[PDB]
Structures are given as structure tokens and as C-alpha cells.
Amino acid sequence: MNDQELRAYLSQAKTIAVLGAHKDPSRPAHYVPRYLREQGYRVLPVNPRFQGEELFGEEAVASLLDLKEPVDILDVFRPPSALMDHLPEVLALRPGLVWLQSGIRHPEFEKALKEAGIPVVADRCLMVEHKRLF
Known part of the structure; x- marks a missing residue:
């Protein structure tokens, strides 16, 4: 996969599930997804540690199987x-x-x-x- 192909996946992506999503704004598990959300992506937080809590404007679920819509990119932390x-x-x-x-x-x-x-x-x-490619 090259930049050109990796661009087609990123620009096409709508939903980005974040495995290991965090609340602390100091950690990557939070500021990376936060940056993604501000770029037009629907980031779905997944982390048992913060289940039921709101993150990136969505309720954090404990498992990937708890998500309602299909996932375009699974961002793992x-x-x-x-x-x-x-x-x-x-x-x-x-x-x-x-x-x-x-x-x-x-x-x-x-x-x-x-x-x-x-x-x-x-x-x-x-x-x-994402910064690099776009």
C-alpha cells in the first residue's frame, strides 16, 4: 500500500472506531481521535474503562461488538x-x-x-x- 492507496482509504473513511479510547486529553488515545473528529470523521470510542461515558460526542461502549454501524477504520491503541x-x-x-x-x-x-x-x-x-497525506 502506497500513499495514493492509503489516501483512498482515509478520504473514504467515515467511521473510525477507537480501541482503547481515553478521556485524559494528555494521551494519544484521546487527542488523536479528537483530531480525527475535527476532520470530518465519526469516531466511535470503545473502552471498558470508560463505558457509558461520553467521548468525542459519543457514548463509550465496552466492546467492538457493541457498535451499531459498520467500521471503516479500527484505530487501535x-x-x-x-x-x-x-x-x-x-x-x-x-x-x-x-x-x-x-x-x-x-x-x-x-x-x-x-x-x-x-x-x-x-x-x-x-x-x-492523516496530516502528512492531506
């Missing part, structure tokens, strides 16, 4: 050691593209996603890359 347990959720949800934030890689998780036919982008910040 959860650490590598917490990814395999969520694999079945991501496979079921089947987002158009799974995005692993900075400092997050997991060979197995990524392979499983690729084998399922789901595009993956890892160790990259969605805010930084």
Missing part, C-alpha cells in the same frame, strides 16, 4: 499483549482497515487479520499520517 484476546472481535466486526498505533506491533495478530483478508497498517499514528 491497546498494547501488543492485549491484542490477541480481541482478535475474535475484530474478525467478527471485520472493519475495512485495522490501524495499529505507534509502538504497537504483533506478528500473529497481524497475520491472522491478513489471512482473513483485512488490510492492516501498524506502528503509525493516524493523526500524523
